[model samples]
Target: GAEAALAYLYSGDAQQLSQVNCSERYEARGAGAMPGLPPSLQGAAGTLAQAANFLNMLLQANDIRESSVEEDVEWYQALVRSVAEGDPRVYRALLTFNPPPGASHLQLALQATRTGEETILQDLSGNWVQETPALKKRVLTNDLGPQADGYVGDTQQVRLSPPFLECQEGRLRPGWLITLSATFYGLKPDLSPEVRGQVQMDVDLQSVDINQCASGPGWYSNTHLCDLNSTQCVPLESQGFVLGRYLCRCRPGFYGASPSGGLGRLLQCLPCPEGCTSCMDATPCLVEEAAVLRAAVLACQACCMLAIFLSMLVSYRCRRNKGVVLLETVLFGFLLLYFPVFILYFKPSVFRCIALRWVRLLGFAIVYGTIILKLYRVLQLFLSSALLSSGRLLRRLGLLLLPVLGFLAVWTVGALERGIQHAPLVIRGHTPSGRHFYLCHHDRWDYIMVVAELLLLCWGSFLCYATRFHEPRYMGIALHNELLLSAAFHTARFVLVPSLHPDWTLLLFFFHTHSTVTTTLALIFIPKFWK
Candidate 1:
């Protein structure tokens, strides 16, 4: 009941807003900030560059056509609406526009923004106005708010007059409303799409701040404009800061070292005295001493919680006749989640969070462990009585694994050296032709480790899944199903990761092959060696 209410409040629809009057900043902040923004909007400057290039092309054609300024304005109005409605299909939209064989460049640029529906009208003073408004209808408002170009706080409460929104017989379409009043009277005749009349639509994630916090989708605020149901803003505190994972901004009295990394200061207060932390004006501090103190307190608290949790778990397992091995399995599952949390939040340096990379390597070790464990069980399956007689064989099997694992480790190190020293010709940023190649470029070594481990782990896990053991009371079907199901998921990861990232596909394939074969052989050998 509590979670469902909070979800509705945090939703980006501003029409649902009440009390705080946060309608103006809806798209300006929160709506654009949703997780998984369309791929078109996610990449850095590429889309901006593309938009600029389109405008430039329009300008070159307009110069050739010598189009009238009034007509140019109408076309620009139409194009902006097209972008607003169309889903980033910029190239196809250009085809609808036509330029005369020898038309001036200005006219060609003007044509791109028009919806091809504008009725061109000529005026005596060399200014042009469309008989019909372009797109939905052009909305031109002169009110640029208080500050056009000014400081952040004093700058603006500006809103663009809503342009075209026309509903035809059955469907809704944007109507273009053109601002034909002023500011472009002089440039009207000379304005090309690139030079004067231009439009750029940009989007970014919304920030979470205390001022807007209580008003929309927030909790634990001293001030309240309206209740959560009346206003669409869900309370963030009720949500346990999970929203921070997606929209990673410091909230209320906190400051972060980076967007996704650890919190640096509970609050950054400037005017605080010594030893007095968290006073209104003196609340925020990123002091190392303060952070260390917090970490110590948090660690002690977490340790106690973990202790209590394990105690309960141990008690239950003991009552059921299961030992620490079963407890370890449960711990392993938790390790899969929180271990990544620790690495991502606690460790510093590296451009990418490498927690997953280390987990992949450790997963390989677990696969090896499972293989050895399975082989032990398989020996008992076939030679149940003889297995107890050959304790020395188990010791010998361990001795063999030591050299095999050590050799694989050495091979992995060599491959990493090669990849770091020579591979990675493609540099993401800067010029295509870089002068030098660095051994590792931020987590490059980790990528190599990932490839090496995948090959070994895949094999080990397959053997673990395939080999069977006897169940005393319950049907072996349940345990067999669980083992195979776990292996399927683990193996599926090897396939999925490489398929998503083709550059590493071949390297990962080798790792996959090595893992499956090595462990299968070990499983076959175990019972024979025991006999």
Candidate 2:
């Protein structure tokens, strides 16, 4: 069999040799025939015979003789004794026992190993596991090896320190056995292994403690808890444990409960009122509602009532005071603008957002265009007596809204295309809470168009006031004062443009109504009321 294997190896057909039956062949036959001719026949062949004899000697040598059962028993017993004695010779025994089954060694340094009481040591079959004096220990530690951050090379062997084993009686306990397994492997210079061996050893420990229990921090025998001195840590009594060390949390409407304890307080989850769903310490709660809108509604209602009374008074004086109709029309514009104020008093929706934009635009435009047309007509009347009888100026005044209406139509189309939607608007405030008002998201064009219209009206009113001396009668003086008042009012409104945000919208509504009503009373209703 050896000759056959040698022939395959030399012929480069070693892959065809059956390694499975190798040991069986060696056991059945002592040795195979020599590879070359006999030594005695080589006497007459001279140097060639000598070469053949050398080859014959090599084949006949029995360097790999089989071992007896006694030898195997003696080697195994010596290894077992060395392991029990805790001698370093046990390492040598493991190395020599290479090429055996059921052995492996995991050389773990202090930085990379852990074990527990339920840990089992088993052979390849797994059924031959040892379970008597089981191990229990902590896995993570601050221990570092000589090379604190480097890897252990295959040439450098490493080993783990055994965990402390304490017995209940502080002495050796019977029936306890300690098992150590070691496997050897040969490697080339590049660390590729050329041979593998398995070896396992079981030794009886004279005494070992199996009653010790070990646990890491933040953990008990079977329970886990939060660490002490941790911030925002609260008790989780609902989970059957009140240790509170592991279950720190902030409730709803609060935030910033981290474990580092930098938040200062043990339980730092603070409540955030003012309609805020969440907040942190020293931070403002974002608010959704406030009392400012209510106040605006009340003020707007008062202004509306006063305007109604003023409108009635002006109605009584229009026949005597010819300029009364102009002020009356402006008063009605202010009234129409107040309708959107009601929507701002409540939580906004899509329909209300759309209605508010349209109403404000149309109302302000009507008021502005009416005032400008009135001024033009008055100036025309001042220039010529034929202007009133011509009826052409009247038609123009009637059609003054054509451009305003056209702009409104385009605005509505753009808004519809952009898709009418409402979003919350944040209003900065003095307290630790800012108001968030839900309002329509109007486009830039919508604001630009309205402001442009009002500014143009202001310009026209100024023009009319500059030509007031053309008609020096008492009526001219009255119209002149009214023009000045309308100019100032529209200019202020244009500057303080209304925001769709509830808080801002409400303020704008108040400003519009109060200024308009006050100006109407001073210019038209007050004089007529006194009379």
Candidate 3:
């Protein structure tokens, strides 16, 4: 039955064709006629005749009227063809016909005829309509009147236009009007005379860049575009560079005024919360800026503490040698280095600044100097036939301690007397700007301390080699040999490696501490406990 009705409407049925008298002049005659109505169709009697001819051609292609399906066709087909041909007057006159209750159904049929195709309709203000989906989605969704309620009987009772949208000259464009009509009334089925009048309100609506800071497309300088409060500008259509057509987008810490008015006057771009480079809301301020350095600091502290814990648990006989006691003191001092390292790495301050430098220097001095003193003692003990049988062993031992102890005293006094020493180093890594690395300056004397200790360990290793064949004292010789090798390896590693950036010196410090603790515990403490 539906197909028959469709076929009948398109067929050459006289009753359907007589719905509007196409042979007569259906001209817009009143003050109500919208100014935008096409001049070609204004009062032109030939236009309606041509519309009738067009409908006849449309039906001739199907040839169903000859088969007697004429009753299925309705008069609304004539109205639909006339309105599509730009005759708003004919659409208006339908209200006077006193047509049956089926007029609404006929209106529905007319809307269904050209479902997807767009056509020009001069809105009530008289503006021509042409639109694309993007223009509608991007620009016209706002200001289009509310969805049409079914027509009420009077114009006063019905809202023809919403408050924001007006029918002033050139104020409305056809694309926007048509899109609004489509959105509100949906192809605008003529449910009532008032509904049709409301749609006609826009028939006569009026027809309607900078470089300093580069005004992009879609920007208006005076009454339009951006306030720098709007979104940042972006290139359009993924091509071309025109400040005139650039998109206005909010900056990283901003957003659009309305979700839908991306580029329109009604919507603007607005800012997000402070301290937010990019965010939905504000972000908190920095507790510390050197976030990455802090992470490295924390990791080094953990490693040193872990080494201390493991060493203390295993070394029961650590007290057997004074050398082991000094080694343990160095391990504890290395752990204490964590706080000063963290402070100096970020922003430096003044309390004990020189003392902190001494803390580091004195700690390393104690460890290396202790190893050297023991090495000297082992040499003196091995050469006992030449020296130990002499009656003054204590005096000779005190005399032996002088060299290492004097080195520590001189080094410590010079460091503290200097007041404060800062070595400025350049650190390179993933920071916004390349970072600055500062530390206690290690002058020529510091390197000399390292070289001198290294010489002492080397000479001690040579002495242990010379006494390798002394069978009665072979155990003591083996012990001294292993201890010297561990000390030499740790000392050489600390001195010879390329210096690390002070911000990352904590990294080097951790590696040195962990290795030193493990080596001393293995060579000195482990053996005594096992024995």
Candidate 4:
């Protein structure tokens, strides 16, 4: 809430403000001296710039519209009502206006103050008068309190008299109300060094010292505000003092060396390190990595992929064995699609998402189709024995995969559900000493693929149970099916805690994919080599 208020106040860029050529200065007491402002107003030279500054902050407090000096009358009516109802903060509700809100760069003594729906009218020779006595009009006497400038103070009474009475035709002297917010000590008649010594002898002496803290420009006290893009006004104890008062610190999504990023005194900033959305010191808020652990896993996956291809070169007898090579080569083709799946894990696009889905489905279909077909071949041997000799249904895994391909086609043509979009997988709201997280996005349709994988496992499980008595020991259906099912379940449901970092989530996905492909190849090939 405070940040919102403070950001609005300083939202104007320094370059834009410099070019504004506008200005206000009111002395608050000693010590309140504003750094950037002159001792008093610099005529009309700083008029538009300072006015623009205040207007910008005011507009930001409401909603920003950079240049709106001349808005429609209807908007002013509602707007004036708030000021008219008496907003206590004068700077917020007050500003220097022209007799011109129009495009005319003309000047006049015309000033706008916060009062509901009431406007002052007068000719050059005549007195300015309020048309109607507002519900709470406070200007009584008219010394025209302070300057034609803005002030920050209490009692809005210095007493101003332009006459609220429409009936008064006579020219009368008006009293000016100058309400004081800040203090400036008047000069002492006594000696300077012996100033405090006279205080003990005179008990009634309330005013003794001549010296005081530098009196600041009253309303523009926040002139040293903040750099909206980089830092913020701390509003803490000692706000922006050369003595360390009203100092600023870095905003979120930026980093610095000190707590305020060393912005406290210098009023300058440095950018955060790469990939860091926010940070403390050199430590990044959202960090990514590539290291020994990741390298080792990639090497293992690459070697296993190569090992599958190596079999084609060495196992020449398998080429003549139609049963062995036919289904075995499908596993090799599955590997072709499988390896690319690992490469597309970075933030990706439309075809990458579509390709990722289909590739996984292709590998899934091949592995499950090949396993189910082999199990069915054994079941055919036990069921009748003559059915297999008829040399028809269970000879190769080809026909079995057509249904798998058709299922995959339905999912693909279904647009694979929705458009695959990348997103930062932030662990929102669970930030108990937390940092921002990032990862590739996920979805409900992915859940559908998970369910389909589990169903495939169940089919393999059912087949294994059916062939328990005579099932070939080499099949290893239960062993590989259980392993595949665990990987799918861990991937689909129980692995990531919402609080887990994105890098760890990525590694888990890598492990699951690599382990699934490697062990399945291991279980299938290891027994063959031993036999």
For every candidate structure, what is the RMSD over all alpha carbons to the true structure, in angstroms? Answer: 31.2, 23.5, 19.5, 22.5
Which regions in candidate 4 have their CA more than 4 angstroms from the true location?
1-287, 314-324, 333-341, 383-396, 416-444, 467-471, 474-499
Q: Which candidate is the best by lDDT?
A: 4
The deviation in Å at residue 108 for candidate 4 is: 49
- Which 10 residues in a row give candidate 1 its minimum summed lDDT? 178-187
Q: Using TM-score as the measure, what is the rank order of every candidate, best first?
A: 4, 2, 3, 1
Q: Which lDDT tens digits does candidate 4 get at residues 292-355? A: 7666766766786777677666666766765455545665655765565356445545456556
The per-residue C-alpha lDDT of model 1 at residue 211 equals 35
Writing each residue's lDDT as its tens digit, candidate 3 over 444-494 gives 666776566557556656655665522224334444554556566556645
Please provide, for model 2 over 106-169, each residue's C-alpha lDDT reduced to its tens digit, 9 standing for 90 to 100: 2110110112222222222223222101211122224562111111112112111221112223
C-alpha TM-score for every candidate? 0.24, 0.42, 0.34, 0.44
lDDT of 1 by residue, 268-293 (tens): 22222323243232333322223554
* C-alpha positional error of residue 521 in candidate 1 after TM-score superposition, expressed in Å: 26
TM for candidate 3 is 0.34
For model 2, how big is the CA root-mean-square deviation? 23.5
lDDT measured at residue 125 in model 4 versus the true structure, 0 to 100? 14
What do the candidate models score in CA lDDT, each in turn? Answer: 0.35, 0.41, 0.38, 0.42
